Structure formats: structure tokens, C-alpha cells
């Protein structure tokens, strides 16, 4: 199977035609995506099989073939880039300055970009191209727009 580092679309042949349900990152032999995209289910990569290794519904994350590898974090000051991979459209970098999700357990960066639901799992990057989290788990604000958290896992 294709284990090349990079950004990937998560597709399904269950519904009419081929439908993009999400996006994920391949890094160091591990596939990283959001839990709500696959719901823990196994993935196909050509003829190779990707089996889930770690997952957590609260964090809304899941890794395949190995533990979570992404550990870079937003510095709190710099602009970041969402490598948005929308359904039926090409990968497109979009630079934004993140906001903050103020929670009882600490603050989290948040990207205020609006994209289709199939864009869930698109990586958020820092100036050196390191993945600082995934886009796809957020909230809808007063004006109907979508604000996603910068969801990052823990590296063991």
C-alpha cells in the first residue's frame, strides 16, 4: 500500500458515487485523521489495509498503523496555514491568524475558516511546514459561520 508522507482524501463507495468524507495526514508510516470521519473503521490504500491503532471520541482523533506522531504546537502569536482539501477540488493553502477557544481546561487555538464537512481532517501548518493540529472539530458562531479548534494529539 501507498505509505508516502503527505495529505490524503478519505473516500466512501457506500453512498452514491464516490463521496469524500474527510481528509488525513500520513507521517512516519502513520495515518492521522479525525474520529468522526472513519468512526474507527479500517481503511484501504490501493490493495493495502490500514487498521486503527489509537483513538479517542472526546479528542476526536484516530491514528492508523501506529501511535499518534504529530506533536508540533501553535506558538500563540504566529499566522498559520490550513491546507484545505475540499471535495472534488484541489488542495489549497489558506493563511489565517488563529483565535482562541477559552475552556475550563485551558486555551486552544482556533481557525475561523468555512469549508464543506468533507474538509474535516485537513492539517494546520506552522512556518516550517510542521503539522500543529487538524481542522474539523468546532462550533457554529452567531453569524452561522464555522470556527474549528486546532486539534492536536499527544506523542508518546
Amino acid at each position: 500500500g501507498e505509505t508516502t508522507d503527505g495529505v490524503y482524501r478519505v473516500m466512501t463507495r457506500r453512498l452514491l458515487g464516490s463521496t469524500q468524507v474527510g481528509v488525513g495526514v500520513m507521517q512516519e508510516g502513520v495515518f492521522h485523521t479525525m474520529w468522526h470521519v472513519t468512526k474507527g473503521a479500517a481503511l484501504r490504500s490501493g490493495e493495502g489495509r490500514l487498521d486503527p491503532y489509537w483513538g479517542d471520541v472526546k479528542q476526536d482523533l484516530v491514528s492508523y498503523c501506529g501511535p499518534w506522531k504529530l506533536d508540533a504546537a501553535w506558538d500563540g502569536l504566529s499566522e498559520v496555514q490550513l491546507l484545505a482539501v475540499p471535495p472534488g477540488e484541489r488542495a489549497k493553502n489558506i493563511q489565517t491568524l488563529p483565535g482562541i477557544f477559552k475552556t475550563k481546561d485551558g486555551d486552544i487555538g482556533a481557525v475561523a475558516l468555512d469549508y464543506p464537512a468533507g474538509t474535516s481532517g485537513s492539517p494546520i501548518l506552522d512556518k516550517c511546514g510542521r503539522v500543529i493540529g487538524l481542522y474539523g472539530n468546532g462550533v457554529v458562531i452567531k453569524n452561522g459561520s464555522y470556527v474549528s479548534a486546532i486539534t492536536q494529539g499527544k506523542r508518546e
Binding site: 501507498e2 508516502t4 508522507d5 503527505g6 495529505v7 490524503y8 482524501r9 478519505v10 473516500m11 466512501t12 463507495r13 457506500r14 468524507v21 481528509v23 495526514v25 500520513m26 507521517q27 495515518f31 468522526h36 473503521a41 479500517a42 481503511l43 484501504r44 490504500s45 490500514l50 471520541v57 472526546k58 479528542q59 476526536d60 499566522e79 496555514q81 491546507l83 484541489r90 488542495a91 489549497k92 493553502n93 489558506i94 493563511q95 489565517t96 491568524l97 488563529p98 483565535g99 482562541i100 477557544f101 477559552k102 475552556t103 482556533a110 475561523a112 475558516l113 492539517p123 501548518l125 506552522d126 512556518k127 516550517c128 511546514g129 503539522v131 468546532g138 462550533v139 458562531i141 470556527v147
Partner: protein, 39 residues
């Protein structure tokens, strides 16, 4: 049954479309992973 297709490289791109605001929101994270606005 789900499958993956490569969509590109992970790189920082100079001169990309800069857009979007930076709000400071009050939120709550539930056991099911759902974020919500606290007011």
C-alpha cells in the same frame, strides 16, 4: 467501505490567500467531543 487517495505534499506556501478573523470565544467540550458556546 472507506479508502485513501493522496491529495498532495505538506508544505508552507509563500504568497497564499490570507483570509479569516481571530475570535476569542468561550466554549465547553462535552464527553462526546462536541464543542459549544458558553454564555
Amino acid at each position: 467501505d472507506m479508502y485513501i487517495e493522496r491529495a498532495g505534499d505538506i508544505t508552507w506556501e509563500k504568497d497564499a490567500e490570507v483570509t479569516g478573523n481571530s475570535p476569542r470565544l468561550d466554549v465547553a467540550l462535552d464527553e462526546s467531543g462536541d464543542f459549544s458556546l458558553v454564555e
